[PDB]
Design an enzyme around this catalytic site. Structure first.
Site, PDB file in Angstrom:
ATOM      1  N   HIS A  82       0.818  -1.220   0.000  1.00  0.00           N
ATOM      2  CA  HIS A  82       0.000   0.000   0.000  1.00  0.00           C
ATOM      3  C   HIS A  82       0.849   1.266   0.000  1.00  0.00           C
ATOM      4  CE1 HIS A  82      -0.212  -0.564   4.505  1.00  0.00           C
ATOM      5  NE2 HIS A  82       0.302   0.662   4.411  1.00  0.00           N
TER       6      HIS A  82
ATOM      7  N   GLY B  16       2.141   5.896   9.719  1.00  0.00           N
ATOM      8  CA  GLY B  16       3.573   5.912   9.439  1.00  0.00           C
ATOM      9  C   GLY B  16       4.303   4.699   9.986  1.00  0.00           C
TER      10      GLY B  16
ATOM     11  N   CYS C 249       3.430   1.524   9.402  1.00  0.00           N
ATOM     12  CA  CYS C 249       3.368   0.396   8.479  1.00  0.00           C
ATOM     13  C   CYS C 249       4.749   0.002   7.985  1.00  0.00           C
ATOM     14  CB  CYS C 249       2.405   0.658   7.334  1.00  0.00           C
ATOM     15  SG  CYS C 249       0.755   1.113   7.894  1.00  0.00           S
TER      16      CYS C 249
HETATM   17  C1  LIG Z   1      -5.637   5.206   7.025  1.00  0.00           C
HETATM   18  O1  LIG Z   1      -4.441   4.515   6.667  1.00  0.00           O
HETATM   19  C2  LIG Z   1      -4.558   3.261   6.128  1.00  0.00           C
HETATM   20  C3  LIG Z   1      -5.761   2.715   5.692  1.00  0.00           C
HETATM   21  C4  LIG Z   1      -5.784   1.443   5.147  1.00  0.00           C
HETATM   22  C5  LIG Z   1      -4.608   0.732   5.049  1.00  0.00           C
HETATM   23 BR1  LIG Z   1      -4.603  -0.928   4.112  1.00  0.00          BR
HETATM   24  C6  LIG Z   1      -3.411   1.245   5.512  1.00  0.00           C
HETATM   25  C7  LIG Z   1      -3.365   2.537   6.040  1.00  0.00           C
HETATM   26  C8  LIG Z   1      -2.026   3.182   6.381  1.00  0.00           C
HETATM   27  N1  LIG Z   1      -1.802   4.446   5.666  1.00  0.00           N
HETATM   28  C9  LIG Z   1      -1.795   3.457   7.875  1.00  0.00           C
HETATM   29  O2  LIG Z   1      -1.161   4.447   8.227  1.00  0.00           O
HETATM   30  N2  LIG Z   1      -2.223   2.489   8.715  1.00  0.00           N
HETATM   31  C10 LIG Z   1      -2.366   2.443  10.128  1.00  0.00           C
HETATM   32  C11 LIG Z   1      -1.844   1.325  10.781  1.00  0.00           C
HETATM   33  N3  LIG Z   1      -1.601   1.277  12.096  1.00  0.00           N
HETATM   34  C12 LIG Z   1      -1.888   2.369  12.815  1.00  0.00           C
HETATM   35  C13 LIG Z   1      -2.425   3.521  12.272  1.00  0.00           C
HETATM   36  C14 LIG Z   1      -2.702   3.578  10.909  1.00  0.00           C
HETATM   37  C15 LIG Z   1      -3.540   4.708  10.365  1.00  0.00           C
END
Ligand SMILES: COc1ccc(Br)cc1[C@@H](N)C(=O)Nc1cnccc1C
Ligand SMILES: COc1ccc(Br)cc1[C@@H](N)C(=O)Nc1cnccc1C
Lengths: 304, 304
Positions: B41, B143, B145
C-alpha cells in the site's frame, strides 16, 4: 491506536555489553570509550558477600585478574579503580560501538528501559520505573548483575541504572553509573527490606490521559476535585501526593484531550474509591503507574 | 526474581530498518541482503485505499519512483515486484548489517517482539501475541506500516510479521514476510471487524507456572480436574480449548514446579469462576495470556 509498555530500541546498548570475570565470579559490564563499568561485587566470593571489605578485597586484585570479553574477543585491562559501588576497568581499546551517552541519576517515578544480560549477552528488554522506595520491579536472575537501565534522546543514550542485587522480597536494587545506590541499599547480603511502595500518581494520571486518547473513556465522570481534596484520598491509598509541578507536567496531555487535570483527578479519585467493577483500562485491570507524562506523549506522537 | 513482559533485544532488527517513499506515501521497509520488503500500500494515495487495484497501480510505478533511504543514505532500486501484499525492492547493495534470518508464518497464540518504526527509525520495542482471531493488540500510529515482528534464536532472527493496518476497532492486522495476511484481512479501507478474541489458555497456564516459580502461589488450590471438565469451563469464558498437545508443551514447567498440568487447570478453573477477589498475580489483576510456555522457560532460565 493501542498503548503498550514500550521499551527503547536496545541496539545502542547491546553494542556496549561485555562479560567481566574476576576469579570465579562472572557478570556484565558496560564498555563506553576505553572504560568498562561493572558492579564492584565482581571481586567477591559468595562467602565474602555477608560483610565484604571492598577496599581490602580489591588490594588482592591486579589488572590481569579482571577478564573482559566483548563477544568472543578479549579486552586488555590497563587500569582499575573503584568509584562508590562500581569498578571502572580501563581497557586499551575504545569501544567502536560507543554511542553518544550521558550518565544520569534519575528521580523516583521516572521510567527507563533495562537490557537484561547474562555473560555479556543480551537476553531481553523491558520497561521499568524507579519506585518511590528506590527499588525496581525487574526480571533478573543470578548473572544479570551489571545489566543497565537507560533512556534514549534521539541518538544520545542516558544510562541511569546498573543492576546490583535482589532483595529477599524479590524486588531489585542498583546504582547510577557513578556507583551510588538508589535508596538506602548496600551491596552486602544482609537484611534489607524496602519501604512503602507508593503508587506514582502523576504516572497513573498520564496513563488515564493515554486511555482517553485511545478510546477507553468509561471512567470519565461528571466531577471535579481540588489538589488538597485529591491528596486526602491519595494518602489513604498509598499514592504519592500530587503537586502543582505534577499538574504542570500534565499540561500538554490536558491540552491535547481538553480534560482539565483536576477533572482527571476526580476520575482517579472515584476509581480509587470504587475500583474498576470488573472493567479494564488499556487492557489492565489495575491502575498503571509506570508510564510518565513524557512517555505517553512520546508513544501517542511517534517520536523516534 | 521478577517476571516482566520482555521483548527480544532489537539491535539486529534496527540494522535492517529503512524508509520507503512512493509518491506522497512514506512507510518502513525491511532491508535484508539486497531486497527491501514493505507493504504494497506504499503505492496508494489515501483516495486509492477505498478499493485499490494494486496490479494496475503498480503498472504506473518504475524503480526510480521507490525512494529507499537507510538512515541518511539513498539506496539504488534496480528491480521491484509484488508478492501477495508486500513489495520486494531489489537494491544494488546488500545490507552490511543483515543478520542470520528466516521468514516464518506463526500460529495464533505465539508471541513475538515488534520494533515500532516511523520514517525508517525505531521508536520502541514491545512484546505481542498473534491473537486467536489473527489480530495483534499493538501500538501503532500512521507511518508505522512496515514495522516488523520477530523472534530471535541465539543469532538467527525469524521475522514473522509486517504491520499493514489498523482495524476501526483499534486492533492491528498484517502479514508474514511473504505478504500473506494473518487472518481474513485485506489491505483495503473497508468494513473489517475482528472475530471473537479468545484467551490463549496454554499461555495463561504457562504464566501461572511463572507465578508459582516467582513466589505468587495464593491461587494454588486442593483441586484437580480433567481436560474435558476444564474445557467445559474454558468454553464458557471464551478460552481456547486445551488439548493434549498443550499439556505436553507445559510438561517442562510441570516438572520444574512439581504441579501437575491438570492441578494447574483446576487453579485456573477456580480463578475463572471466582475471579481474583481484588488480588494480583505477578502484578497483574487479570489472567495474562501473552507469554508462551517457551517464553516462561526462557525468562525463568536466562537464555541469551
Ligand atoms: C488510514 O491509513 C490506512 C488505511 C488502510 C490501510 Br490498508 C493502511 C493505512 C495506512 N496508511 C496506515 O497508516 N495504517 C495504520 C496502521 N496502524 C496504525 C495507524 C494507521 C492509520
Ligand atoms: C546471591 O547473590 C548476590 C548477593 C548479594 C549481592 Br550484593 C549480589 C549478588 C549477586 N551474585 C547476584 O547474582 N544478584 C542477584 C541479582 N538479581 C537477581 C538475582 C540475583 C541472585
Amino acid at each position: 491506536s493501542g498503548f503498550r509498555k514500550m521499551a527503547f530500541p536496545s541496539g545502542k546498548v547491546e553494542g556496549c555489553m561485555v562479560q567481566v570475570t574476576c576469579g570465579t565470579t562472572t557478570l556484565n559490564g558496560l564498555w563506553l570509550d576505553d572504560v568498562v563499568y561493572c558492579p564492584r561485587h565482581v571481586i567477591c566470593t559468595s562467602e565474602d558477600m555477608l560483610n565484604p571489605n571492598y577496599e581490602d578485597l580489591l588490594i588482592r586484585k591486579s589488572n590481569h585478574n579482571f577478564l573482559v570479553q566483548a563477544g568472543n574477543v578479549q579486552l586488555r585491562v590497563i587500569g582499575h579503580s573503584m568509584q562508590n559501588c562500581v569498578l571502572k576497568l580501563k581497557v586499551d581499546t575504545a569501544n567502536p560501538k560507543t554511542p553518544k551517552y550521558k550518565f544520569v541519576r534519575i528521580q523516583p517515578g521516572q521510567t527507563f528501559s533495562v537490557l537484561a544480560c547474562y555473560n555479556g549477552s543480551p537476553s531481553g528488554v523491558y520497561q521499568c520505573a524507579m519506585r518511590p522506595n528506590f527499588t525496581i520491579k525487574g526480571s533478573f536472575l543470578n548473572g544479570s548483575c551489571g545489566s543497565v537501565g537507560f533512556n534514549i534522546d534521539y541518538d544520545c543514550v542516558s544510562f541511569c541504572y546498573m543492576h546490583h542485587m535482589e532483595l529477599p522480597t524479590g524486588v531489585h536494587a542498583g546504582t547510577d553509573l557513578e556507583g551510588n545506590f538508589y535508596g538506602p541499599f548496600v551491596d552486602r547480603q544482609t537484611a534489607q527490606a524496602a519501604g512503602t511502595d507508593t503508587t506514582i500518581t502523576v504516572n497513573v494520571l498520564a496513563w488515564l490521559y493515554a486511555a482517553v486518547i485511545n478510546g477507553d473513556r468509561w471512567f470519565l465522570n461528571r466531577f471535579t476535585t481540588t489538589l488538597n481534596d485529591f491528596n486526602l484520598v491519595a494518602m489513604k491509598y498509598n499514592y504519592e501526593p500530587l503537586t502543582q509541578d505534577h499538574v504542570d507536567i500534565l499540561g500538554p496531555l490536558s491540552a491535547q484531550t481538553g480534560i482539565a487535570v483536576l477533572d482527571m483527578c476526580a476520575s482517579l479519585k472515584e476509581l480509587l474509591q470504587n475500583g474498576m467493577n470488573g472493567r479494564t483500562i488499556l487492557g489492565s485491570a489495575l491502575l498503571e503507574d509506570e508510564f510518565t507524562p513524557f512517555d505517553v506523549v512520546r508513544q501517542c506522537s511517534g517520536v523516534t
